[PDB]
């Protein structure tokens, strides 16, 4: 009698308390019965009525009781805000840890939902606070992808891990980086296990002040250098230091931070150029590109850091693999001129 299930997880859902009390009197009444593959243990936890839930709970209810998407009543009870049910759950013996069909945890659904008091009693009762979902995704992933700070915060008290990457090698520093959120760097920095892993290393090499450099965040890479004491001169694969990456992407703010913190200038990348070098090659190729439009049918920037390399101690003699100096890339005779005034 799909009715009479109906009836019951209807009740549930909006708290008819009276209502569930004369339904679990019957005997065609089934506790775990599905309308639209909904029971009303998840409905009762998804909207809070702890008094419902306890009823339920006298019932014998299947508790790990999944719906399509592998949901249990503790997922569903993320979907809200109220802590109580997940005492209520627990008490229950409900396992806080199940996984759903992306593998998400409990926690993992109130941290995307921004729902502190459920992260905070899932944590209390010693929830894992680092499983991953089916995209290596962790808690602290989301809590960063969501920009939930204050949750984030929760987390890391709790013990979540810094260290794990996801699926497409990104730890939570790695991943605050590439997102551009400078306030969760600024707790997961307060939060180091130890010191050096600011300067951990995914696959290709890229370190979390590779990434904010690479992507222009400014303020993400200012905490790596200043509070992270980030290792300025990691190279990754490609040999490239951060400096090589701003520099190639004419992120400026990021080429005077890196600089002015002490960037070493002249380490070499795979193809043996400097930072300096690829200034005045990125340069250059806008010249050719100008003079290209004008005998068809941003140099500023490249050489206004080229400038700032060289007035900052960047060697003007380096040679790469071609054998060619940084002046062998610019034959702008002006620019020349002005790297030599302001150097030495």
Not at 119 to 134: A, M, N, R, Y
Not at 142 to 159: C, F, M, N, T, Y
Not at 274 to 303: F, I, N, Y
Request: charged residues 25%.
């Amino acid at each position: 009698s799909g009715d009479l299930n109906e009836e019951l997880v209807k009740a549930a859902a909006n708290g008819d308390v009276a209502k569930v009390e004369d339904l679990l009197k019957r005997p065609d009444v089934d506790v775990n019965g599905q309308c639209a593959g909904h029971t009303a243990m998840q409905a009762a936890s998804q909207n809070g009525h702890v008094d419902i839930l306890k009823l339920l709970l006298k019932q014998n209810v299947d508790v790990e009781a999944e719906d399509k998407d592998g949901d249990r009543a503790v997922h569903h009870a993320a979907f809200g805000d109220e802590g109580a049910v997940i005492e209520v759950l627990h008490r229950g013996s409900a396992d806080l840890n199940a996984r759903n069909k992306r593998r998400q945890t409990p926690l993992h659904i109130a941290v995307n939902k921004g729902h502190l008091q459920v992260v905070k009693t899932l944590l209390d009762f010693g929830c894992h606070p680092s499983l991953q979902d089916s995209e290596g995704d962790t808690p602290l992933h989301d809590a960063i992808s969501k920009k939930r700070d204050d949750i984030l915060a929760v987390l890391l008290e709790a013990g979540a891990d810094v260290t794990i990457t996801n699926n497409n090698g990104f730890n939570a520093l790695h991943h605050a980086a590439l997102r551009g959120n400078p306030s969760a760097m600024r707790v997961l920095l307060s939060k180091l296990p130890r010191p050096w892993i600011v300067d951990e290393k995914k696959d290709d090499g890229y370190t979390a002040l590779h990434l904010a450099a690479l992507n222009n965040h400014v303020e993400v890479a200012e905490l790596l250098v200043h509070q992270g004491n980030a290792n300025l001169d990691i190279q990754n694969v490609n040999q490239q230091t951060a400096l090589h990456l701003a520099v190639e992407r004419q992120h400026t703010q990021i080429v005077r931070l890196l600089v002015r913190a002490g960037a070493k200038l002249d380490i070499q990348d795979k193809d043996g150029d400097t930072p300096l070098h690829e200034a005045l090659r990125h340069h250059t190729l806008s010249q050719l590109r100008q003079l290209q439009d004008m005998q068809d049918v941003e140099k500023k920037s490249a050489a206004s850091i080229a400038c700032f390399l060289a007035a900052n101690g960047a060697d003007l003699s380096i040679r790469n693999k071609k054998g060619q100096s940084p002046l062998d890339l610019c034959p702008d005779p002006n620019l020349c001129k002005a790297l030599a005034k302001c150097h030495k």
